[PDB]
């Protein structure tokens, strides 16, 4: 309507219509919050790494959170964050702010470094890192002798690999294609919806006030009705597109949660 | 065996139950408790040779050394039957001194 | 009362390069999971409704 | 003892029932016409209008 009493009175005769749209959108928002909370919140406590770090030669400085920075994020997290860039539409903030998500990730990582996979089932149990790596080689079918005899070489390879991945992520662009794609899709959908507000739909004008103060009521009402039906159709289309995209995102989030529960809290 | 798929912990088995428009699973899982601190060591040097555990881990209660399974404290005396040998105690980082008892020599008397 | 959500408890597991922790007892826990599989079958006729 | 442990199934049933309720309630809208009852329109006016 855009603040027009006549439009509201005309619209009253279409029955309960936008209650459906509001219910659908509220369902979508609740689903988003549930998705995030399900993926990340999977530990009962918040662990912390010891101040002194001697993990048999391995080096996790690139990944562990940095207390110096205000956000308590890490190097790779900062790289990822930096690389990627009205008429009743409203955007609601997510329930979880980024600091709490970073805190979950830090707790998970500290737990998996210090306890192995034991903290996934019960209470976390300490274990020296080299022995954990020996367990993990023994898992895949190689005797634990190999790691104890080539610890130095293995640590060097791991450090070189982590440095290489940091450099490749820092330099090469167009690596985070999917997230940027999602953002672009949402922004474009909103943009076209707001753009749609400037079409005649077979009426004499695209602005309501002019139509009001040009004709008598019995003739203006037809144009009003045409505007009403056109805008309602556009709104329905937008809602349906949002529903489809939300379903796809939910499937992706479920897959991510399964991957994180199976390949982080235990060997696969 | 896929962790946290059905249950929360180590899976043992499950039971199905009907429900008006769906199903209800009862998962039975195993959860450990009542921990205890111990001192460890990756391998044992003895007679200039390194010994590793076939299946288990070395622990010490303060004075003696034992091998246990990784999920339940149950110490046993280190013997040439539950350990294997490879190399010499010169390239492992953390090896400690001890003696490995074997049955055949005392049996022979 | 309105407050700031608390993520959880706090602890710092004692890590050292020659110390482990081994369980000495166990427990058996039974949990439940619920899943929908179906919904009611309905049917609508045009010419009667419209 | 404790209730509200079967939220998912109840949610499904509620959603279906509410969709049917709004669908059947939609049958009482003039939609810009002069009445919401077809038989009244047939009884009052003539086909050409
Ligand atoms: C882990 O690797 C990092 C590499 O980022 C090491 O940090 C570098 O250390 C050298 C030596 O002092 C410095 O010249 C670099 O400027 C450091 N880089 C950064 C980004 O700070 C770190 O020293 C390694 N860990 C240990 C224990 O040595
Ligand atoms: C570590 O375990 C050993 C093996 O049981 C303990 O040695 C025994 O201690 C008991 C205590 O009365 C004696 O009766 C046994 O004769 C000891 N064994 C031998 C072979 O002499 C040892 O005391 C334990 N240490 C600690 C700190 O618990
Ligand atoms: C485990 O950590 C300890 C301390 O963090 C290390 O102990 C040092 O070992 C060297 C080598 O013998 C000594 O020169 C130092 O004096 C020790 N530190 C102290 C404070 O006494 C130990 O090397 C590490 N690795 C193990 C035990 O395998
Ligand atoms: C384990 O025992 C061996 C021999 O019983 C020790 O090896 C001796 O170490 C000292 C100190 O470095 C040397 O002076 C001797 O020449 C070594 N003897 C032999 C035969 O190699 C070894 O040090 C002991 N382990 C520990 C951790 O002390
Ligand atoms: C195992 O040894 C540690 C250190 O000797 C015991 O002390 C705990 O140390 C951690 C980290 O330093 C603290 O968070 C705990 O509060 C300490 N315990 C107490 C009672 O204060 C520890 O208690 C021992 N036992 C276990 C099961 O870890
Ligand atoms: C493992 O834990 C169980 C209970 O969690 C212990 O069983 C209890 O033992 C005490 C003392 O013997 C009894 O008073 C209780 O009645 C027992 N509970 C039950 C349910 O039977 C068990 O003793 C623990 N394991 C060990 C080796 O002590």
Swiss-Prot record, chain D:
Region entry Heptad repeat 1: which residue ranges?
1-31
| Substitution effect: residue 42 to F | In strain: Omicron/BA.1
Domain of life of the organism in this record?
Viruses
What effect on the protein does mutating residue 15 to H have, as reported in its record?
In strain: Omicron/BA.1, Omicron/BA.2, Omicron/BA.2.12.1, Omicron/BA.2.75, Omicron/BA.4, Omicron/BA.5, Omicron/BQ.1.1, Omicron/XBB.1.5, Omicron/EG.5.1
- Coiled-coil ranges from the UniProt annotation: 10-49
Reported function: Subunit of the fusion protein that is processed upon entry into the host cell. Mediates fusion of the virion and cellular membranes by functioning as a class I viral fusion protein. Contains a viral fusion peptide that is unmasked after S2 cleavage. This cleavage can occur at the cell membrane by host TMPRSS2 or during endocytosis by host CSTL. In either case, this triggers an extensive and irreversible conformational change that leads to fusion of the viral envelope with the cellular cytoplasmic membrane, releasing viral genomic RNA into the host cell cytoplasm.
Name of the protein described by the UniProt record: Spike protein S2'
